[PDB]
Amino acid sequence: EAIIRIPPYHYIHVLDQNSNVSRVEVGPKTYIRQDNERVLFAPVRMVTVPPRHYCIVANPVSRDTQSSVLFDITGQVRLRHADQEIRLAQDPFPLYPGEVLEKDITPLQVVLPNTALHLKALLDFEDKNGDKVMAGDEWLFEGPGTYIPQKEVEVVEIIQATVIKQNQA
Amino acid sequence: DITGQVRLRHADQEIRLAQDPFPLYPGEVLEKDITPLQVVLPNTALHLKALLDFEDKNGDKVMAGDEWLFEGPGTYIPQKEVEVVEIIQATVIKQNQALRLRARKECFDREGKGRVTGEEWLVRSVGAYLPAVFEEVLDLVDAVILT
Amino acid sequence: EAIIRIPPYHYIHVLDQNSNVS
Amino acid sequence: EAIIRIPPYHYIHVLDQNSNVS
């Protein structure tokens, strides 16, 4: 029906047929749909990201230096396509049309002092320390911590440190 | 919130103690209610892993790998960040005995010896004793009689 | 019904449809 | 119905029940 009551933490991907493009509608508004527009679905809950948790979404919306969402000239949200998007803890956010939520709701990669993460690169990428990373390179994240995933980094495995009792090799 | 809905901190939670009764608000989720505060005996302690890095009451930084050990007669105050791994009774040690232990991680023991992983050592001290969060209880070791 | 008698230590999450908010 | 298309030279006396006024 024409009347569309959106709950405050909910959103809909309205599809305007005149401009032939989709766009988000979000917030505690009773924003009724225009007849030219079509509402594909009931107000989906805005994605929630718990503290010390992460999620990844394929075909992320493009962002500027302000990291504000950048709509394409068509009125559709612009997308980075093959690129993905990691996320951590923040206020809940609407999903946008053309996005693909590959991943959600998981505690951040915790790791014990006597074990480490084995991490092949998927493709060459910049490191936090400014180091270049070859695809053949294998990261080894040791120590008590919570590693931050990259879309480029792939998690090969985990290796426990080997205890060595006296008079052994 | 400007919409007129109550604003929410989302992934964040909220601990509460004793106070006058309060309304619930829309969008809230009551994960927990009605439970006596975490009491603890003098000869036992709380083992507490961090869920994620957080500020301590004393201003200390807390790593996720850090393990809190709350000993003594008391009533510990929970944090939304703190996770309750378990509880460990202090090990009593009768005279002429020693408490065998093992190092699950590199660190320093109360003896002050450097402790490589898998290392074992005696606890000479008589009477009740609380193992460290890295320390692992094995067994009391009686002294052999020597006539 | 339109009449809502709230007991002194009680509450309700009213949902206003006009502002579309609780 | 909820949808009300007003022609450019036309008008309606809407009656709001909340404020009890037209």
Angstrom distance (rounded) from CA C10 to CA A33: 37
Q: Which residues of chain C have a CB within 8 Å of the CB of A31?
A: 20
Which chain B residue's Cα is nearest to C21?
B5
Interface contact C16-B4, CB threshold 8 A: yes
Is residue A159 within 8 angstroms of chain B, CB to CB? no
Query: Taking chain B, what is the end-to-end CA distance rounded to the nearest angstrom?
Result: 82
Q: How far is CA D19 from the centre of its chain?
A: 14
Q: How was this structure determined?
A: cryo-EM
Contact flag for A and B (3+ C-beta pairs < 8 Å):
yes
Say if B and D touch: at least 3 Cβ pairs within 8 Å: no
Breakpoints of chain A, after residues (C–N > 2.5 Å): none
A3 touches chain D (CB under 8 A): yes
Structural element, H or E, at residue A14: strand A10-16
State how far the Cα of A133 lies from the Cα of A123, in Å rounded to an integer: 8
Task: Judge whether C21 is closer than 8 Å to chain A, CB to CB.
Answer: yes
**What six digits make up the tokens of B88?**
């460990």
Report the gap between the CA of B147 and the closest CA in chain A (Å): 33
8 Å CB contact between A137 and A91: no
> What subunits touch chain C, counting only 3 or more CB pairs under 8 A?
A, B
Q: Where are the beta strands (DSSP E) in A37-143?
A: 37-39, 44-45, 47-49, 55-58, 86-87, 90-93, 100-103, 109-111, 115-120, 125-126, 132-133, 138-142
CA distance A163 to C2: 72
Single out the residue of A32, A24, B124 nearest to residue C20, CA to CA: A32
Whether chain A has a CB inside 8 Å of the CB on C2: the answer is: no
DSSP state of A38: E
CA of A84, closest CA in chain C: separation in Å?
33
